[PDB]
Amino acid sequence: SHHWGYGKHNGPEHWHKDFPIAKGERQSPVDIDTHTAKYDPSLKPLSVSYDQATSLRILNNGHAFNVEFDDSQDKAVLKGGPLDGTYRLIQFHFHWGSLDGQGSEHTVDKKKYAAELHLVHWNTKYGDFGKAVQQPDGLAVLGIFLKVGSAKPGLQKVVDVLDSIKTKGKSADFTNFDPRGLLPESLDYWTYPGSLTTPPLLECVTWIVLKEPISVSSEQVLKFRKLNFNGEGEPEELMVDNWRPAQPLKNRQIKASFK
Ligand SMILES: COc1cc2c(cc1OC)CN(S(N)(=O)=O)CC2
Ligand SMILES: COc1cc2c(cc1OC)CN(S(N)(=O)=O)CC2
Ligand SMILES: [Zn+2]
């Protein structure tokens, strides 16, 4: 209900008490064991078509910040790869850490990255996002790791607006943002069936996790860490470590798009 989060007392280890699916058979994130993932020749080429993406607004929802898109038409879509049909971009957000050595949700051979970007798309055959999350193939989330190094120019516009949405419930106009600037060079990926990584933890996501991390600067991620979980006029709780740890793989195979 009201109060799941990422603190010591309402964090991932507590979510199962309100969302029993937390201990389910296809939970996310997972560790990606690179030596055990198998190249899959049946995967079709991945198609990220964001040229007509229409960003609208950026929102601090008390868990992360969301950059929201107009998904009232097929303006920005994800197709191909493991996906059947057309998945429409609705929003992106990140998960990040208090320190550069943690923050990602997925891990790679148990390595944690400083952060992880989630580009969230819903299967248009289900008509709207709320319907799609009730379906095993309702969403496709494109996950991209962030490591700390050189600045990501295409991220800076996001960074510079965070001061205006410091606290929970704050939003700002965020039009004309092009998410293609957040992508790495290669679209090589791993894929597996999983879930939302926050409550309600619905098992409705085809995860597509890019192999190549993007580099962002220390300065850029430091500004992520100045956001607040709390609302305005409440004691400051820095928005850090808003990641769920790796969950049991159970009866799933992670597939690779690349040899
Ligand atoms: C009112 O105090 C609390 C409320 C709740 C939790 C813990 C609390 O004490 C810290 C954890 N749940 S959960 N299972 O993570 O969704 C949500 C509600
Ligand atoms: C708006 O409803 C939600 C949307 C999303 C999430 C949770 C939601 O309800 C809490 C978390 N995921 S994620 N982390 O990529 O698995 C995707 C977007
Ligand atoms: Zn996420």
Curated annotation (Swiss-Prot):
Residue numbers binding Zn(2+): 93, 95, 118
Effect of residue 93 to C/D/E/N/Q: Strongly reduced CO(2) hydrase and p-nitrophenyl acetate esterase activities, impaired stability of zinc binding
Active site positions: 63
Gene Ontology cellular-component terms listed: apical part of cell; cytoplasm; cytosol; extracellular exosome; myelin sheath; plasma membrane
Impact when changing residue 66 to L: Reduced activity
Outcome of mutating residue 200 to A: Normal CO(2) hydrase activity, but impaired stability
Mutagenesis / variant outcome for changing residue 196 to E/H/R: Strongly reduced CO(2) hydrase activity
Phosphoserine: modified positions: 1, 164, 171
Domain Alpha-carbonic anhydrase: 2-258
Keywords, comma-separated and alphabetical: Acetylation, Cell membrane, Cytoplasm, Disease variant, Lyase, Membrane, Metal-binding, Osteopetrosis, Phosphoprotein, Zinc
Function, in words: Catalyzes the reversible hydration of carbon dioxide. Can also hydrate cyanamide to urea. Stimulates the chloride-bicarbonate exchange activity of SLC26A6. Essential for bone resorption and osteoclast differentiation. Involved in the regulation of fluid secretion into the anterior chamber of the eye. Contributes to intracellular pH regulation in the duodenal upper villous epithelium during proton-coupled peptide absorption.
Record's protein name: Carbonic anhydrase 2
Protein's organism: Homo sapiens
Gene that encodes it: CA2
